[PDB]
Specification:
This is part of a larger assembly, with two copies of chain A. The first copy, chain A, has 96 residues and is mostly helical. Helices cover 41% and strands 0% of the residues of chain A. In chain A, helix 4 packs antiparallel against helix 5. Chain A: This is von Willebrand antigen 2.
Chain lengths: 96, 98
C-alpha cells in the first residue's frame, strides 16, 4: 500500500518535468528498496524523492512543488521551513 | 462547428491539440469516429501530450489515422517553448504556399 508513493516520480507532474534531464527509473527502484527496508509508513519513500529532486536541481531544474505534491517534508531546525532554491549570502540580523 | 463547411479549399487546416488529462472511459467511446471524420474532412490533428496525466492512448489513436498527425509528448509545459520552433516549422511544412 506504499508502492504508489514511489510511483510519484513517474506519475506526478512536478517530478515529470525533469524526465528529459533525469531518468526516474533508478530513483523509483531505490525507492522500492527503501520501502522494503524501512519499518515506517509512507515516509519510508522520501529519501529517494528528495535525492531525485536534488539531482534535478543539479541538472538545472528545481522541483518547486515536490514537498507538497507528496507527503515528504525534510527535517529542519526549529522555526525554519524547508524550501527549494534558498539563496546563498543569506541575510541575518547582524550582516550588512 | 469550426469546420462546419470548408471555406478555404486552398489551405491546409490543422488542429494543434494541447492535451494534459485523461478522458473517463464513458466519454472516450466516440473519439476514433471524430478523428477519422476529421481526416475525412482533410483536417490534420497534431496531439501534444503534456505531463504524466495525458492519456497516451488517444495520442497514438490520433497518430494511427495518418502520418501527418505526428505527435509530441512532453514532461511539462516548460518545454513547450523548447518545442516551439520544430512545432511551427512542422505546421508550415504541412501547409502549401500561395
Amino acid at each position: 500500500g506504499l508502492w504508489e508513493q514511489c510511483q510519484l516520480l513517474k506519475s506526478t507532474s512536478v517530478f515529470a518535468r525533469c524526465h528529459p534531464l533525469v531518468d526516474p527509473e533508478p530513483f523509483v527502484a531505490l525507492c522500492e528498496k527503501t520501502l522494503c527496508e524501512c519499518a515506517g509508513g509512507l515516509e519510508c519513500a522520501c529519501p529517494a524523492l528528495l535525492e531525485y529532486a536534488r539531482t534535478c536541481a543539479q541538472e538545472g531544474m528545481v522541483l518547486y512543488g515536490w514537498t507538497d505534491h507528496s507527503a515528504c517534508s525534510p527535517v529542519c531546525p526549529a522555526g525554519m521551513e524547508y524550501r527549494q532554491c534558498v539563496s546563498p549570502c543569506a541575510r541575518t540580523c547582524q550582516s550588512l | 462547428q469550426i469546420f462546419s463547411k470548408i471555406d478555404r479549399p486552398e489551405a491546409s487546416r490543422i488542429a494543434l491539440l494541447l492535451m494534459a488529462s485523461q478522458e473517463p472511459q464513458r466519454m472516450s467511446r466516440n473519439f476514433v469516429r471524430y478523428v477519422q471524420g476529421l481526416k475525412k474532412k482533410k483536417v490534420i490533428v497534431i496531439p501534444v501530450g503534456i505531463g504524466p496525466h495525458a492519456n497516451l492512448k488517444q495520442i497514438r489513436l490520433i497518430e494511427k489515422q495518418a502520418p501527418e498527425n505526428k505527435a509530441f509528448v512532453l514532461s511539462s509545459v516548460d518545454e513547450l517553448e523548447q518545442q516551439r520552433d520544430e512545432i511551427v516549422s512542422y505546421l508550415c511544412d504541412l501547409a502549401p504556399e500561395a
